[PDB]
Design a protein around this ligand. Structure first.
Ligand SMILES: [Mg+2]
Ligand SMILES: [Mg+2]
Ligand SMILES: [Mg+2]
Ligand SMILES: [Mg+2]
Ligand SMILES: [Mg+2]
Ligand SMILES: [Mg+2]
Ligand SMILES: [Mg+2]
Ligand SMILES: [Mg+2]
Ligand SMILES: [Mg+2]
Ligand SMILES: [Mg+2]
Ligand SMILES: [Mg+2]
Ligand SMILES: [Mg+2]
Ligand SMILES: [Mg+2]
Ligand SMILES: [Mg+2]
Ligand SMILES: [Mg+2]
Ligand SMILES: [Mg+2]
Ligand SMILES: [Mg+2]
Ligand SMILES: [Mg+2]
Ligand SMILES: [Mg+2]
Ligand SMILES: [Mg+2]
Ligand SMILES: [Mg+2]
Ligand SMILES: [Mg+2]
Ligand SMILES: [Zn+2]
Lengths: 83, 116, 177, 65, 66, 64
RNA sequence: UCCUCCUAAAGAGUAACGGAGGAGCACGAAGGUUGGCUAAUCCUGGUCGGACAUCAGGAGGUUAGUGCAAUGGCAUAAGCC
RNA sequence: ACGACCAGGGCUACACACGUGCUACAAUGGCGCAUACAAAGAGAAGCGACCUCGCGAGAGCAAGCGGACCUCAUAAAGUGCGUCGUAGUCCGGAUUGGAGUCUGCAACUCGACUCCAUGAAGUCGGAAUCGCUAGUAAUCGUGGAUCAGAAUGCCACGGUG
RNA sequence: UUCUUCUAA
RNA sequence: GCGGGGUUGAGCAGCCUGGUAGCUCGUCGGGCUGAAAACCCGAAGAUCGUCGGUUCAAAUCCGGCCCCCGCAACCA
């Protein structure tokens, strides 16, 4: 996990989409390749799409997701079973 | 003989017999006995009830046998209902911390399951 | 008989108040507390039954009626006549002295106790519960025993409804919710 | 090996796999390292239905006692 | 009751860590010194503690300050 | 007498495909199809590689 | 060879290589008597308990029971201790 | 475009089979305090004392050294004393939940380490099979190259023997 | 004392 | 018409007065071998022919059946 003296990590181009989402009032999917971004409490209720190498999957950001990073909710290896 | 819900053994030394509580190991057991004044190399037999009743309030500061199994299970089921990566690792049966699953992930996956 | 003395001076006035009973004989009184250890794995030998009987003769101060199977079922490999579980029916003077020891001592000595239930009154006020281990009672010495027993406590009372047994036990501070 | 492949349009996709199938590979059974020319022969045939019960009809008969 | 079949039933002393000497009747016989009882069990204090549902933002803003 | 025509024989002479594992190609002597992608074929997907046979089989029938 | 039902036509009987099943035992109590008791099954609640042991009510009213086939019996019980 | 740039992803998957390894199953030991003895290397965007803070990983500040000078660096097994008394244990450490630190735009997929908790299998391993003739096998620690960080591998070095 | 075999460039 | 049989993939035991499944081979995983045999080692498998029934319980007991194996189907 990241240091606490640095603060949590989010990307600027995600931050200039969340504040755009809070202002102009949209339920639009914000598709974002930043899997490494810690969810901020203003991101709660934002339908944001997180890349998983191939496609985007909508992560409806619940309150219970604030500590965790966006890539935990967009799994990249699609596994079903060997038989 | 009885601390915090369970029946601690009576022949072991005090920093060893307290370890039976789900919630202390050896470092927190040395911190339980750090404020009860008890020398850490006495047995649970030949103690005092004035010492054992003092000893339970030391254990009552920290989270133990019944109360610790519930915060752990709430934290694991927190990951289940999120459906995060850590939650999928718990509800499939595979190791969560990113270990090897190609060879010898046996502690989560149980014994060997041959091809039918 | 402390709680029966406690029944006749505070419980009767409380239940006549909140239910508006006509007659004082209409109040729910408890009738019997039945202590079963149905030990179905006592078909192995006598000693899993006759010792578990004596673990209940310590809890309730009575020798238990070692009961037998009513019919024969074959999923359990028992026949009609095998002794399969011992019970104790407690009435009067030794009912309340048990019911004093139950709600005071034996209930807070349960490992991971968070409270009893309130959906456990068998439709007609008779509160039927059950405990997981026989050593919640101080009667059972922890050292001298060997097997994790378990009994189920069944309180039978003359409540016609279901809430009237739910309110009778709350008069004796019974740990529900 | 004979495998029945049950799916939609199996014969429309695998009727063009009839005939031989030559290989030229340095094999596993060859110990001098040389390369051998082998073959197999695949014959994809469809699932024709069963003949079913030919029930003799007592008007197509001629019974001589 | 019957004259033989029942065990020795005696009024005893049941003290606790809240000092409550309480005289019950029982088959234990000896002077009983309990550990927790109905007076000192946290069914009325600590059961609102032990659920630990918690909030997530109030934990997250606690770690640092913007 | 309908799988005898489909097999034909088993020798190296009556083939339809080859699989040259040194230079890694799958020819197809019905048309030409000398394409140098065999590890896509032998391991798996010939899904767009039965398809060129069907076009010239359609060309046997739309040119009728 | 014996027992039970039907064919047997409302007393008894009544045939067929007619339709159905049983018996060639058991029991020193499974007999005698006195005292007492009331079944199957299902819903609900309940430690391990599971569709089903035991336990607690309730429904139910003999669908249970009889050492066994079938019929006629049986609560005063012929059933159960 | 089979060339090229980028972003995220993959090489880190998991019904399983094998190879090479480390840590074990303990009493010739585990833990606790004390105390003795090395060799060989590395280092300037680097090695970083001392000092204060933190349970600890580490943080603040700042000497010294291109080094037989200063730093990394305390060698450990050992010896003395105490305890454990043959139990899945004061053996074992997997695994998991919190709570952290550091490196790095960035530790979710996937880093190492720390702290508290949890304490699986394992009680010396079937058929079989491997290494080794003397400072050897055995067991103990140390160092380096690679590297921002990331070894139980590799290449070196000594200690008991 | 038993102890077989190695297809085709 | 009367006997006997149906038991893992296959060839078969055992069903004993009902409480419970055995073998040879085949199969799986390792071992040996340059590799495949042979051999060594670890293994797993059954809803006991079908559908009813009687018993608390049926592979076993009873009744009917579908195949299969025999035997007898004759005096005219
Ligand atoms: Mg512990
Ligand atoms: Mg008549
Ligand atoms: Mg007549
Ligand atoms: Mg009789
Ligand atoms: Mg009578
Ligand atoms: Mg009689
Ligand atoms: Mg890239
Ligand atoms: Mg790789
Ligand atoms: Mg292995
Ligand atoms: Mg020692
Ligand atoms: Mg240890
Ligand atoms: Mg370095
Ligand atoms: Mg310090
Ligand atoms: Mg030492
Ligand atoms: Mg041992
Ligand atoms: Mg630890
Ligand atoms: Mg074990
Ligand atoms: Mg030599
Ligand atoms: Mg490095
Ligand atoms: Mg041959
Ligand atoms: Mg072989
Ligand atoms: Mg059977
Ligand atoms: Zn108290």
């Amino acid at each position: 996990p990241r240091s606490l003296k640095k603060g949590p990590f989010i990307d600027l181009h995600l931050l200039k989409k969340v504040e755009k989402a809070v202002e102009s009032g949209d339920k639009k999917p914000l598709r974002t390749w930043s899997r490494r971004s810690t969810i901020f409490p203003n991101m709660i209720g934002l339908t944001i799409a997180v890349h998983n190498g191939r496609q985007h999957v909508p992560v409806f950001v619940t309150d219970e997701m604030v500590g965790h990073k966006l890539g935990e909710f967009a799994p990249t290896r699609t596994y079903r079973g060997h038989a | 003989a009885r601390i915090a819900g369970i029946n601690i053994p009576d022949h072991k030394h005090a920093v060893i017999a307290l370890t039976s509580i789900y919630g202390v190991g050896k470092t927190r057991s040395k911190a339980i006995l750090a404020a009860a004044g008890i020398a850490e190399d006495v047995k649970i037999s030949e103690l005092s009830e004035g010492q054992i009743d003092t000893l339970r309030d030391e254990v009552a500061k920290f989270v133990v046998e019944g109360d610790l199994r519930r915060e752990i299970s709430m934290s694991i089921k927190r990951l289940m209902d999120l459906g995060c990566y850590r939650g999928l690792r718990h509800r499939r049966g595979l190791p969560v911390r990113g270990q090897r699953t190609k060879t010898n992930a046996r502690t989560r996956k149980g014994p060997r399951k041959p091809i039918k | 008989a402390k709680l029966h003395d406690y029944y006749k001076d505070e419980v009767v006035k409380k239940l006549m108040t909140e239910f508006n009973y006509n007659s004082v004989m209409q109040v729910p009184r408890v009738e019997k507390i039945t202590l079963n250890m149905g030990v179905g794995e006592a078909i192995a030998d006598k000693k899993l039954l006759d010792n578990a009987a004596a673990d209940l003769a310590a809890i309730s101060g009575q020798k238990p009626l070692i009961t037998k199977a009513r019919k024969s079922v074959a999923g359990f490999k028992i026949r009609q006549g095998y002794p399969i579980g011992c019970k104790v029916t407690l009435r009067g003077e030794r009912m309340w002295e048990f019911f004093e020891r139950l709600i005071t001592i034996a209930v807070p000595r349960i490992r991971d106790f968070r409270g009893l239930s309130a959906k456990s009154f068998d439709g007609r006020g008779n509160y039927s519960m059950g405990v997981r281990e026989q050593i919640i009672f101080p009667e059972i010495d922890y050292d001298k025993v060997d097997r994790v027993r378990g009994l189920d406590i069944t309180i039978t009372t003359t409540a016609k409804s279901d809430e009237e047994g739910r309110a009778l036990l709350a008069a004796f501070d019974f740990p529900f919710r | 090996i004979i495998a029945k492949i049950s799916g939609d349009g199996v014969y429309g996709r695998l009727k063009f796999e009839s005939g031989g199938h030559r290989v030229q590979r340095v094999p596993a059974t060859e110990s001098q390292g040389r390369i051998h020319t082998s073959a197999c022969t695949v014959a994809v045939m469809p699932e024709l239905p069963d003949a079913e019960l030919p029930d003799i009809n007592p008007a197509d008969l001629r019974i001589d006692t | 009751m019957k004259k033989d079949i029942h065990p020795k039933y005696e009024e005893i002393t049941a003290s606790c860590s809240c000092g409550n000497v309480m005289k019950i009747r029982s088959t234990v016989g000896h002077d009983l010194n309990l550990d927790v009882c109905s007076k000192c069990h946290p069914f009325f204090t600590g059961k609102q503690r032990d659920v630990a549902t918690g909030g997530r933002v109030d934990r997250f803003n606690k770690r640092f300050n913007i | 007498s309908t799988r005898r025509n489909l097999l034909g024989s088993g020798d190296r002479s009556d083939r339809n495909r080859t699989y040259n594992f040194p230079q890694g190609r799958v020819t197809d002597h019905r048309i030409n199809l000398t394409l140098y992608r065999l590890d896509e074929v032998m391991e798996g997907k010939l899904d767009m590689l039965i398809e060129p046979i069907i076009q010239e089989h359609q060309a046997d029938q739309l040119a009728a």
